[PDB]
Amino acid sequence: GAIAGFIENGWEGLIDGWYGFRHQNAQGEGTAADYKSTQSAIDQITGKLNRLIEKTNQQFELIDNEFNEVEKQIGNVINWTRDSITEVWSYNAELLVAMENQHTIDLADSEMDKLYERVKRQLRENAEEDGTGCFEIFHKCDDDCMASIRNNTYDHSKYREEAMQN
């Protein structure tokens, strides 16, 4: 969706979370972090690890002998089998990780897009999309009004009148 698309890069300064707001107004410049977006992405990645870091209760024992070789014919069937199973698990492993990585990336991209379009709807015509993940304000929001946006309390009408004119 979004991500490395209309957001050309990420913020190496944002060390408080995965996703955050960076604003500029009269009182200066500031940068915060969105806990609920960050935690949702984190809890989902965590859910993958718990499921993949997994323990088998299936015990296997020797059918082979490395001190004294078993008979060749049965020995060859055993190796042939073991190798076949190795190929299967090597395959499963490679596919699993590649599949999981594709989804992890898309999931993190998704959570960003979900956050963005929620802010866009958190206001109204009181702002317009700059295009690069920025929201231009037509009523000059201050550091208290910005906090109203961050903790989700910004009123999509009690700045409308003013912003509509601009």
């Binding site: 991500i3 490395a4 957001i7 890069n9 990420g10 913020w11 190496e12 944002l14 995965w18 996703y19 955050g20 707001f21 604003h23 500029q24 969105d34 992405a41 990645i45 993958k48 690890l49 993949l52 997994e54 323990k55 088998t56 209760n57 015990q59 296997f60 024992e61 020797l62 082979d64 002998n65 490395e66 001190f67 004294n68 190795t86 190929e87 698990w89 090597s90 492993a93 490679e94 990780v97 590649a98 599949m99 999981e100 990585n101 594709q102 992890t104 990336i105 993190a108 991209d109 960003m112 956050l115 963005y116 700059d130 690069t132 993940g133 920025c134 929201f135 304000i137 910005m146 946006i149």
Partner: protein, 314 residues
Amino acid sequence: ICLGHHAVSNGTKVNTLTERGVEVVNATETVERTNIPRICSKGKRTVDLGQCGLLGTITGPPQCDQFLEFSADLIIERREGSDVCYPGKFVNEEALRQILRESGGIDKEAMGFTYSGIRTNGATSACRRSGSSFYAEMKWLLSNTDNAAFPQMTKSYKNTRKSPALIVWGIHHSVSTAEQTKLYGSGNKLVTVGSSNYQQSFVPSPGARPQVNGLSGRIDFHWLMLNPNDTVTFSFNGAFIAPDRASFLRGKSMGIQSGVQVDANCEGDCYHSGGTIISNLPFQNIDSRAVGKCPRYVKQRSLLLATGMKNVPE
């Protein structure tokens, strides 16, 4: 107001369905490569067989005197171990090993065989104790005098227990036909064995073999599992190594082959000859023949799992 995501200077390349070497913010390993070079045996009843071979615990060469009735959760075979004192081998030897590896150890019981008209104290310098001895659980039956004949004998043992009885016996192959008669007399020697499930027969075969332990003779060991209430019968006329005691399996265990030391400071469930694989990871690239409860063996050295978003720097 502008929003975005976090990023780092140095990310980690991973693989996806569509890209190879795509950098993400954070990743974690999925394939175990770290081995601990000891047999982690904390909290497990462990028996290190050392110089005693596993099959030796049933017959009783001197190296296995301390292992005649062992009891374990974990059995370790060693390369230096030998099943034999007097040169010989087991027919169907590996099947018996796999049985004994998971036996939980063995419990011995006298079969009560008594004899009349023969000898029973046959020994050798290959089995050193006080002096020349023999397999502790076996008896070397000859003829009474330095020659003479061997009476066609018949011995039976009924398994009186609720568990299958491991029965084992031996056929002695002399160096010469002369040696065979010097021991058990002349003529065709025959050993027949049967139960309510088993059906076989055996004949000696004198001849010159190469010297092992100083001797050119061999003893052929054979075995069968005697079911509860079922009876086994030995029909013989010489060249016969009789069982003195039978074996019963104690319970459950895991058997490994290894060259590293035991360590009661670490716990493990996945073993191989080079040590213990302690890991939570789903896969491992250490040893394809690792046994116990292990991650799956894969041929790849490394497979990184993304634990973060795509890393996109300035």
